Amino acid sequence: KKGGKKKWTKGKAKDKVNHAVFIEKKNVESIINNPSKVGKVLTVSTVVEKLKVNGSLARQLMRTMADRKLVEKVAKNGNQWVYSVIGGVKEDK
Amino acid sequence: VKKVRVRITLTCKNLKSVEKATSEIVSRAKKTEQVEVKGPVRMPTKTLVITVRKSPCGEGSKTWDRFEMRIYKRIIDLTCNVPDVKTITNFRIDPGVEIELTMTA
Amino acid sequence: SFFTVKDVAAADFIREYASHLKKANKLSIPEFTQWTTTSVARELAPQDSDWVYIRTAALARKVYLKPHTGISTLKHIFGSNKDRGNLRNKHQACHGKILRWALKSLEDLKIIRKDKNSATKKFSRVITKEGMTELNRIATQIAIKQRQAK
Amino acid sequence: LCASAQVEAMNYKLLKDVPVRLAANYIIKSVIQDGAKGCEIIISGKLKQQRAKTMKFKQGYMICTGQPKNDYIDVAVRHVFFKQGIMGVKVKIMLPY
Amino acid sequence: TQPKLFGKWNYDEVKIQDPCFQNYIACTTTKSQVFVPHTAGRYQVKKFRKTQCPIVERLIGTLMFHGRNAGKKALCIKVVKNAFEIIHLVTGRNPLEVFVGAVQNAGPREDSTRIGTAGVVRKQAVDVAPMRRVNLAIYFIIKGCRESAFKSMRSIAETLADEIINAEKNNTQSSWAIRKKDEIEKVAKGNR
Amino acid sequence: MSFVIEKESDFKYIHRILNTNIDGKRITPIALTGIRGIGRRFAYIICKVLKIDPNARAGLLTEDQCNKITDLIADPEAHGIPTWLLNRINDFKDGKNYQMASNTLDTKMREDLERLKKIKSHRGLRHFWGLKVRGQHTKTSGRHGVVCGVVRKN
Amino acid sequence: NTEETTKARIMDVLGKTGSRGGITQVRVVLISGKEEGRQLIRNVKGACRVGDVLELMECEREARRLR
Amino acid sequence: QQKPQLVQTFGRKKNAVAVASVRPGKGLLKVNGSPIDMINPQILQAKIYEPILLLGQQKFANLDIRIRVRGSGYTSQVYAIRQALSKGIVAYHAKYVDENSKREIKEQLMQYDRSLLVADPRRMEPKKCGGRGARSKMQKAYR
Amino acid sequence: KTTRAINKKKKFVADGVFNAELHSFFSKSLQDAGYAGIEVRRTPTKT
Amino acid sequence: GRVRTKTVKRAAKSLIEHYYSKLTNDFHFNKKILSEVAQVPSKRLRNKIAGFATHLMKRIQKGP
RNA sequence: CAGGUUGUACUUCUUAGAGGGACUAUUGUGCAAUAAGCCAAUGGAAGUUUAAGGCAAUAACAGGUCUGUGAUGCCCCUAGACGUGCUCGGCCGCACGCGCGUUACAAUGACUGGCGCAAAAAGUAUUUCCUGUCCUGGGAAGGUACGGGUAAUCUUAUUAAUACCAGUCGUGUUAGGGAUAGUUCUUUGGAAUUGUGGAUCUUGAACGAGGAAUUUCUAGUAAGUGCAAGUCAUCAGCUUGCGUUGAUUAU
Ligand SMILES: [Mg+2]
Ligand SMILES: [Mg+2]
Ligand SMILES: [Mg+2]
Ligand SMILES: [Mg+2]
Ligand SMILES: [Mg+2]
Ligand SMILES: [Mg+2]
Ligand SMILES: [Mg+2]
Ligand SMILES: [Mg+2]
Ligand SMILES: [Mg+2]
Ligand SMILES: [Mg+2]
Ligand SMILES: [Mg+2]
Ligand SMILES: [Mg+2]
Ligand SMILES: [Mg+2]
Ligand SMILES: [Mg+2]
Ligand SMILES: [Mg+2]
Ligand SMILES: [Mg+2]
Incomplete structure (x- = not known):
């Protein structure tokens, strides 16, 4: 699993959270409808923060929600995506 | 009236001298009756730059000589006959001052 | 009223004309094209597949503004820098194959024209009466849609 | 008033064995006389011996530095041949306004 | 009418309560009320011009400061705009009335002057000036952003945003900025 | 997107290609790059030939997709591919074309340096001794015997 | 963190000190709850004009020199 | 003989040159032959509108201002396109209105920003054989 | 029409060099009488 | 470092010395005089002499 | 909104020539003996002697060059010569030790696509120099089809790159990075093999921001970013200049 050279070394022993590139149909819908879960503001980062989903994937999940008149874009640049969950984050399971 | 448009070109290594020819060529042409002169026009001053490492043997710090040779080109246009020009070119213009002439109708 | 391309960010317009040539597929994506060969000398092959359309698409926008521009110039005018690696980046010229084709195709389309007058650039490409009209329509269509964004 | 000339005059005197100081004096006096506003002479070389040496003779004004310098x-400046080696002779005449 | 910042942030939404910072900041002026933080101004010319600089222009400047990567305000104006949007989406406050507070807090009030005599390194009690205080505050704030921002998917407009917030709070556990702000005073309070 | 249906099985984390070429799950073209023979842009070519989705993840391609590639490489020129996109071109004065495979490549070289070891050409001898050939400068260059010629990842 | 930050302003900029030739010595006047008016001669570091305002975290001080 | 009702104002910033023509009309804004909305740094676009707003849709609505700019860099040109507007609106009021109205607008702009009327003096500073750049130099090992 | 046209730059530099040629020529041979300089007026007719 | 070369001072001194009556309390007017009054090669230098010479004028409006 | 014209029309833009303009000016503290002057504010294109340079005193360093010199003293060589020429090697040889630098460790980023923003330089005797238009090649590069210029007229008022908008990648020594190496193709040159340079597909190393030390650097300055010019048949990682983007801290 790890063959990288002279990289291990005294310091941080921070296991890299295993983000995934696949989402099962059993969670597909359920998660798209639940934006209020990733904090108020939704950026490429936050999305990965709560869901273990790498940006590239996260975007589609954003554009998707953006499409489902569920989220509004604040600003969109190079890697800075600022999205606001319309109505207000009022979801606490 | 056999009118010939004459082009007076003056190119020179230094401004001192080329400005005298220009200044006086017009001074002299305006004063003739068969004359029509387009103001003395000054082309853009071309500068030849030569940067040289001073010292002959490459020792001691970096010393550079920035040498310049400026070339001013002035152009004057004339409405005259063929004798009229040779009448106004009768100056006493400094050395190294090239004067070229073009005749059209 | 009415609007010309000068009234529409073409980055936006090309995104429009690129398609008008798609639905109409008046063209015919040459061989070497799809045959993967990014323009100039770069890294990866283009990503968007219709780059062929986009290139021409804008090439029209370019010619509609700078009439008489040439192959080797547009070749430059597209804008490209090269990471030679250790040696710094030098400015780079584009590709003359895809480029010269696009002009020929736009000519068959009755949009481009080869001027046989100006003795400097004899045969350079220029917009045509019919050709440029087609453009203003796309433009005005976009123009009106922008004003439509109440 | 012409230095290019005076150097030759000096170049001549030196090859005719006229001692240095005596030499330079004649040219310098003669130069100032002609209307110079300041004159100086330099003579680097094996001045009567082993090592090199630089002799300087100056009279009146002189413009060491500035644009007006030129x-x-x-x-x-001239080279003077000797069966010795070489003599360097520089002449700085400073012209009158 | 009043020219809001980035088009959506009233300047008069803030006021400098403390007298210290009143002249050593920009929110307050008519000339300061700018839409864009880009002025290509001519500050840094006399020996106190820096003052008249619209506080955020200063932030942007101090922000494009790492070598190779930086030297281009163009972008930096962005990283700062997004960061303001992001700070708003969290406390929905006039993000200037946030960044501003942070500037007032993150500035150490005390420092130690290294005065060594024949090998021995002694120090004394020194009170930190206002201009110096603000400068330190911003320098500090930004300084930290890059800290985490490195090999992180977290972005400067995010790192910075997250910083300006806690920097206003005085949250000594969430602001590389205020950490020193405290330590510098502490260590300084020791050397004094 | 990445709207997978049967997680753990409707996907294959690791695919086997040309011997030891194990593949990573991320993006298909790029995944291919691990193969000692394919690279950044060659992967992209492959997908246009096999009409396979590029943007799509890696491993969402059956064994059919896998063989399409093993033989695509065996006689690439057959599927098309202009002679000038190949790794190897005109070998040993006869063998027309090929496309240096993960394992093929490794030995092809072992044979060419052998081709030269016997010949004893300068460039050849150079490889033997173990020194850059073209890079000429030896004064400052690669000291403490850095990476010589022919490089293999590990 | 309960500090006694008495705000004081600059009365007169004395001179420069600390051969580090960067420190500044200044005469202050106070404006705070505790006392007020009391004048001190404190040592600053950094940009400072006449009349600024500085938060002293210790009114019991006032080192000094002028030679 | 002729005599159009026009004003010719210019702006400049480190080589950036702004040709601004002002004629009376209905509020046109041409920059190199296009609408302001299309300048390159979508950002700085605001900078150019600063003069417009600072004065009021009034003065802009009555006239047609056409500008052409071929300065040096994206940022600089914008500064000139800016400076031309400001100089022109004022320049118009000088010969075509009450000299008093000019004074109003001049101080009006001056008060907000000088870069609309003044000229950003500084240019570039020439290199020196003393080193690699304008004021930097070849390293210097001492020891 | 004097033979070949030449960059007023190119032809001028040629002019100067020629003058400096003359200077070495004269000074080196006229090493008897006070030599000074040379006012050279060149015409496609008479140098 | 705005100090005056001796020459600059001598000039202003001697100018004022000869033309006091004529000299004004205005630099520009005086500069014109100084130029019409003598040989000042550098146009710039002329000013310096006048700018300073004018200064002296205001110090004589004192007497010492 | 582009294009063509035309007028003894105009100069704001451009050119360059005359002449303006700052001198430390006006105002108040410090100086204060009167002072020279120093400070701050205002006006100002411009106030650190405005900015950047050129020039550079007396002595001297037995500094460096006799391999730049038809500048030389002395001493060397002299025809199987240290003269001159020719063929082929070498100055780049590698265990290593130093010194300028180039590229980078990446999301303030890389890659794909889009986008009329620049300056300064250069340029031919016939094709031999700059090269525009056009044709052919995937491409470097070819052809000679149509052409201007020995230059504010022609390559050009434009072919920079950073920047900006969109898209892909998404922390993963992944390829960020590109060294090393392998066929192919192309240009310079009689000749390139001890890779001239350039294109293609692969190969894909150290590097994860660097110890003791240590160098320049206060404003359109540092930095980054490209462009020229010298050398030059071909070769820049050097040099000398040019412009764009453009700040922290001091005073
Ligand atoms: Mg980017
Ligand atoms: Mg790009
Ligand atoms: Mg000597
Ligand atoms: Mg000076
Ligand atoms: Mg000297
Ligand atoms: Mg010598
Ligand atoms: Mg021999
Ligand atoms: Mg060709
Ligand atoms: Mg060119
Ligand atoms: Mg990728
Ligand atoms: Mg490569
Ligand atoms: Mg080879
Ligand atoms: Mg190579
Ligand atoms: Mg550089
Ligand atoms: Mg060349
Ligand atoms: Mg070159």
Whole structure:
């Protein structure tokens, strides 16, 4: 699993959270409808923060929600995506 | 009236001298009756730059000589006959001052 | 009223004309094209597949503004820098194959024209009466849609 | 008033064995006389011996530095052949306004 | 009418309560009320011009400061705009009335002057000036952003945003900025 | 997107290609790059030939997709591919074309340096001794015997 | 963190000190709850004009020199 | 003989040159032959509108201002396109209105920003054989 | 029409060099009488 | 470092010395005089002499 | 909104020539003996002697060059010569030790696509120099089809790159990075093999921001970013200049 050279070394022993590139149909819908879960503001980062989903994937999940008149874009640049969950984050399971 | 448009070109290594020819060529042409002169026009001053490492043997710090040779080109246009020009070119213009002439109708 | 391309960010317009040539597929994506060969000398092959359309698409926008521009110039005018690696980046010229084709195709389309007058650039490409009209329509269509964004 | 000339005059005197100081004096006096506003002479070389040496003789004004340097100053320098080696002779005549 | 910042942030939404910072900041002026933080101004010319600089222009400047990567305000104006949007989406406050507070807090009030005599390194009690205080505050704030921002998917407009917030709070556990702000005073309070 | 249906099985984390070429799950073209023979842009070519989705993840391609590639490489020129996109071109004065495979490549070289070891050409001898050939400068260059010629990842 | 930050302003900029030739010595006047008016001669570091305002975290001080 | 009702104002910033023509009309804004909305740094676009707003849709609505700019860099040109507007609006009021109205607008702009009327003096500073750049130099090992 | 046209730059530099040629020529041979300089007026007719 | 070369001072001194009556309390007017009054090669230097010479004028409006 | 014209029309833009303009000016503290002057504010294109340079005193360093010199003293060589020429090697040889630098460790980023923003330089005797238009090649590069210029007229008022908008990648020594190496193709040159340079597909190393030390650097300055010019048949990682983007801290 790890063959990288002279990289291990005294310091941080921070296991890299295993983000995934696949989402099962059993969670597909359920998660798209639940934006209020990733904090108020939704950026490429936050999305990965709560869901273990790498940006590239996260975007589609954003554009998707953006499409489902569920989220509004604040600003969109190079890697800075600022999205606001319309109505207000009022979801606490 | 056999009118010939004459082009007076003056190119020179230094401004001192080329400005005298220009200044006086017009001074002299305006004063003739068969004359029509387009103001003395000054082309853009071309500068030849030569940067040289001073010292002959490459020792001691970096010393550079920035040498310049400026070339001013002035152009004057004339409405005259063929004798009229040779009448106004009768100056006493400094050395190294090239004067070229073009005749059209 | 009415609007010309000068009234529409073409980055936006090309995104429009690129398609008008798609639905109409008046063209015919040459061989070497799809045959993967990014323009100039770069890294990866283009990503968007219709780059062929986009290139021409804008090439029209370019010619509609700078009439008489040439192959080797547009070749430059597209804008490209090269990471030679250790040696710094030098400015780079584009590709003359895809480029010269696009002009020929736009000519068959009755949009481009080869001027046989100006003795400097004899045969350079220029917009045509019919050709440029087609453009203003796309433009005005976009123009009106922008004003439509109440 | 011409330095290019005076150097030759000096170049001549030196090859005719006229001692240095006596030499330079004649040219310098003669130069000032002609209307110079300041004159100087330099003579680097094996001045009567082993090592090299640089002799300087100056009279009146002189413009060491400035842009006017090249305007009010004339400078010519010559090589003088000896069965010794070489003599350097520089002449700085400073012209009158 | 009043020219809001980035088009959506009233300047008069803030006021400098403390007298210290009143002249050593920009929110307050008519000339300061700018839409864009880009002025290509001519500050840094006399020996106190820096003052008249619209506080955020200063932030942007101090922000494009790492070598190779930086030297281009163009972008930096962005990283700062997004960061303001992001700070708003969290406390929905006039993000200037946030960044501003942070500037007032993150500035150490005390420092130690290294005065060594024949090998021995002694120090004394020194009170930190206002201009110096603000400068330190911003320098500090930004300084930290890059800290985490490195090999992180977290972005400067995010790192910075997250910083300006806690920097206003005085949250000594969430602001590389205020950490020193405290330590510098502490260590300084020791050397004094 | 990445709207997978049967997680753990409707996907294959690791695919086997040309011997030891194990593949990573991320993006298909790029995944291919691990193969000692394919690279950044060659992967992209492959997908246009096999009409396979590029943007799509890696491993969402059956064994059919896998063989399409093993033989695509065996006689690439057959599927098309202009002679000038190949790794190897005109070998040993006869063998027309090929496309240096993960394992093929490794030995092809072992044979060419052998081709030269016997010949004893300068460039050849150079490889033997173990020194850059073209890079000429030896004064400052690669000291403490850095990476010589022919490089293999590990 | 309960500090006694008495705000004081600059009365007169004395001179420069600390051969580090960067420190500044200044005469202050106070404006705070505790006392007020009391004048001190404190040592600053950094940009400072006449009349600024500085938060002293210790009114019991006032080192000094002028030679 | 002729005599159009026009004003010719210019702006400049480190080589950036702004040709601004002002004629009376209905509020046109041409920059190199296009609407302001299309300048390159969508950002700085605001900078150019600063003069417009600072004065009021009034003065802009009555006239047609056409500008052409071929300065040096994206940022600089914008500064000139800016400076031309400001100089022109004022320049118009000088010969075509009460000299008093000019004074109003001049101080009006001056008060907000000088870069609309003044000229950003500084240019570039020439290199020196003393080193690699304008004021930097070849390293210097001492020891 | 004097033979070949030449960059007023190119032809001028040629002019100067020629003058400096003359200077070495004269000074080196006229090493008897006070030599000074040379006012050279060149015409496609008479140098 | 705005100090005056001796020459600059001598000039202003001697100018004022000869033309006091004529000299004004205005630099520009005086500069014109100084130029019409003598040989000042550098246009710039002329000013310096006048700018300073004018200064002296205001110090004589004192007497010492 | 582009294009063509035309007028003894105009100069704001451009050119360059005359002449303006700052001198430390006006105002108040410090100086204060009167002072020279120093400070701050205002006006100002411009106030650190405005900015950047050129020039550079007396002595001297037995500094460096006799391999730049038809500048030389002395001493060397002299025809199987240290003269001159020719063929082929070498100055780049590698265990290593130093010194300028180039590229980078990446999301303030890389890659794909889009986008009329620049300056300064250069340029031919016939094709031999700059090269525009056009044709052919995937491409470097070819052809000679149509052409201007020995230059504010022609390559050009434009072919920079950073920047900006969109898209892909998404922390993963992944390829960020590109060294090393392998066929192919192309240009310079009689000749390139001890890779001239350039294109293609692969190969894909150290590097994860660097110890003791240590160098320049206060404003359109540092930095980054490209462009020229010298050298030059071909070769820049050097040099000398040029412009764009453009700040922290001091005073
Ligand atoms: Mg980017
Ligand atoms: Mg790009
Ligand atoms: Mg000597
Ligand atoms: Mg100076
Ligand atoms: Mg000296
Ligand atoms: Mg010698
Ligand atoms: Mg021999
Ligand atoms: Mg060709
Ligand atoms: Mg060119
Ligand atoms: Mg990728
Ligand atoms: Mg490569
Ligand atoms: Mg080879
Ligand atoms: Mg190579
Ligand atoms: Mg550089
Ligand atoms: Mg060349
Ligand atoms: Mg070159």
